[PDB]
Design a protein around this ligand. Sequence first.
Ligand SMILES: CO[C@H]1[C@@H](O)[C@H](O)[C@H](OC[C@@]23C[C@@H]4[C@H](C)CC[C@H]4[C@@]4(C=O)C[C@@H]2CC(C(C)C)[C@@]34C(=O)O)O[C@@H]1C
Ligand SMILES: Nc1nc2c(ncn2[C@@H]2O[C@H](COP(=O)(O)OP(=O)(O)NP(=O)(O)O)[C@@H](O)[C@H]2O)c(=O)[nH]1
Lengths: 35, 814
Amino acid sequence: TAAENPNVEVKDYGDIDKAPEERARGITINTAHVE
Amino acid sequence: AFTVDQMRSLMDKVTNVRNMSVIAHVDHGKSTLTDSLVQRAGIISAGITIKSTAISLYSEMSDEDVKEIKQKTDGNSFLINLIDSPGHVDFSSEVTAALRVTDGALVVVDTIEGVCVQTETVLRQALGERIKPVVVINKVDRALLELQVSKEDLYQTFARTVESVNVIVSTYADEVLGDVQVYPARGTVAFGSGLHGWAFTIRQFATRYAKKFGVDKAKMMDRLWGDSFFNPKTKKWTNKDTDAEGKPLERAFNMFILDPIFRLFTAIMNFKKDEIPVLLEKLEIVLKGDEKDLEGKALLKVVMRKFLPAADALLEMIVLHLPSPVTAQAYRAEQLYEGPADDANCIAIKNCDPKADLMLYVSKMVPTSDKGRFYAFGRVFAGTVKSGQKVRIQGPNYVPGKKDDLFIKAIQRVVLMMGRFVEPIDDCPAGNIIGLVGIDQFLLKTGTLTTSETAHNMKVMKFSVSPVVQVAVEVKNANDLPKLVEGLKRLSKSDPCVLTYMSESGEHIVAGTGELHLEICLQDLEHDHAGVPLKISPPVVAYRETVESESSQTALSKSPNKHNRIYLKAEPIDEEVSLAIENGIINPRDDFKARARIMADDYGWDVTDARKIWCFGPDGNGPNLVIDQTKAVQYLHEIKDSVVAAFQWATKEGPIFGEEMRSVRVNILDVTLHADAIHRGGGQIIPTMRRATYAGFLLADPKILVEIQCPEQAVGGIYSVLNKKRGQVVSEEQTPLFTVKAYLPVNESFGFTGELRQATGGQAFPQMVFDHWSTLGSDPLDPTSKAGEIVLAARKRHGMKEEVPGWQEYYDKL
Ligand SMILES: CO[C@H]1[C@@H](O)[C@H](O)[C@H](OC[C@@]23C[C@@H]4[C@H](C)CC[C@H]4[C@@]4(C=O)C[C@@H]2CC(C(C)C)[C@@]34C(=O)O)O[C@@H]1C
Ligand SMILES: Nc1nc2c(ncn2[C@@H]2O[C@H](COP(=O)(O)OP(=O)(O)NP(=O)(O)O)[C@@H](O)[C@H]2O)c(=O)[nH]1
């Protein structure tokens, strides 16, 4: 969507599973919100 | 990248807004799919950061596409709010809150694993919020690369996954919504690989082959799915999978959509460099520049992105099928609103009226980097919220009549919650999601903001949601206690599902939904919230000290002076009576006469004994009593205070190992005092009474609701576990699931939640509340009996001598 709208911040995979636990287990643990 | 003006303009056309989230079992690719959406349509503004809670997407559809949208549309631009949802799926209320602010959901299902319990759990909760679902069967690449699966097998797998899903939907979806099931032919199911950027709908292929087969796409998309066959030999479309001769016909879906894809994979991955250019040319795919040199997966990834852009498939289902707030608040108003259905605020919700009084629901408090400040996250259902606006904050217990939970305060700032960032804005009308700053202190977790004195307050899914896992927390360095007490408060505010309280034994308790949840909580508490070395350990269980029968013989004890003696016997107080005292039927301060009539007429007591209760204990109101049965003691009235005081002391600290007494009745049979008050003084009689009580006690044969919801076939595991833990079934009721109620000793509940999921295949959900005191039949004084082991462990833990002093130790022979 950010290709169509400059007003969308892109979030990459590692920006979403960013927690130290998530990295340690290699899964999502926390809900993440993106726009 | 848009400007605040562009965003605000986009937010005016709520007909072209989509509030939704992604539902997925761990590892099914929820993250990589959203990264795909964000990279393709994410929106960004043209030093305060927040935890990413929601992301905005932007999408434009073609004029023809927009005509297909079966709902009010204004133009070809769409604003999509991808709302973050927690990862704990125990039917928790944190999840329900997140879903509550969405109207549609993108459900991710794995090609191989299919629909798993976690998936069913969030979907079930979603359906309970009248959310419309759309599916994406993800990880398709695994079936082609790893498993080498065949087309018909892949098909069958897809069809079974779609069926599993529509079983959950048909079961929990409100009949008033109509058919909310999902159908590949209607474009509500996508297939693909979030890791590799390609996806499609039958519609896109219909558009592609319509103007080529000389047929309108409405006809084409019906033919591109299910039992439609095109016999190249007859050049005709039929619904029979065989021809006249009976030979096997390949399904249109396989022949026109899968085959081209299969051929691209096979040619590119096998380096057939003379077959790739032709295939690409036929599909009208153009490699430019450095792309012409790619091979293998690299070439594949690039070719599939051009052929069928993933985000494109997902955005198509979102825009065309997920519902836009005007449409939804019309049939969601009544549930959302506790008040009158005819009420002015309920109507404003149904109409999503921005000019009405305010009806803003606070979904949760979100952590910010603004030194311990939490911003309120929520949705404006009615009216419009403004910066510096005077509003009425109503907690979870507020009622229009009382002033409970009410908090009038101005809203400091209205901010757009964009990922980890915020953007101050002046106002926000009904139908939008928004963040409020300055509400921290007044609200923790859910709430309801209104601008009407009449306004009533606002309301929750088949993961654990109860704080069943708990530990005792304490600072390693005494002086740190202040930070710990403060950290717990900070921790509680940031986590809705976390619980902290002080135990009967004086320990700070922290409890979490599950072992993992509790672990994050303790880590965060220790590292951030409190930031001090913490010591973690199990909770100490409290016990009661009672008697099973009357004293086998009169208890006799003398005072230090050796001049005073008390003669008494102890006997059990009936449970119904102890309960009556504990719960308010028999009270310490009631008029002794009326109380005695009740104890005698209703509980079998002798009315004289009752009229003569001297006190309750411990703390003057406990379920233990001293009754006066003496006949001619001269200075009785003068020792009463000493006797009462000694009882408060005796019942507070039992002789078995220092636990409080319960259900203990003490009858004073006789008292012999010295003639002169000097030697009769409390300092003489208080010890006597306490010593005699302990003796009467020891001479009286001393002794010291788990609700589970689950499927039938799983119930067997429940009985299996319970039997392994001195459990006992109580009730088995019920066309939802089953609910087994049972008694489970507290000292048998550590790890129970784990052994239960393991014995029910993760289908059982426990709930536990303290129920009763229960008398252990074993000897408390026998170090090897069940009760005795507990007594020996507590004694050693407290540095007392192991042997329990026996009654003879408090008996003073005449
Ligand atoms: C809403 O959540 C509830 C449930 O988790 C449960 O009812 C739990 O029980 C706590 C205990 C409560 C009992 C009464 C106060 C008297 C006896 C108490 C207990 C002591 O052994 C039994 C349970 C478990 C406890 C020790 C081991 C911590 C209790 C305690 O508070 O010490 O309390 C919380 C607040
Ligand atoms: N082959 C292939 N792999 C993919 C695709 N989409 C995601 N993956 C891979 O599958 C793995 C899991 O993706 P991920 O997005 O983290 O899964 P999840 O569903 O978010 N995780 P969890 O359930 O723990 O949240 C990753 O290694 C990712 O590269 C795809 O389209 N094709």
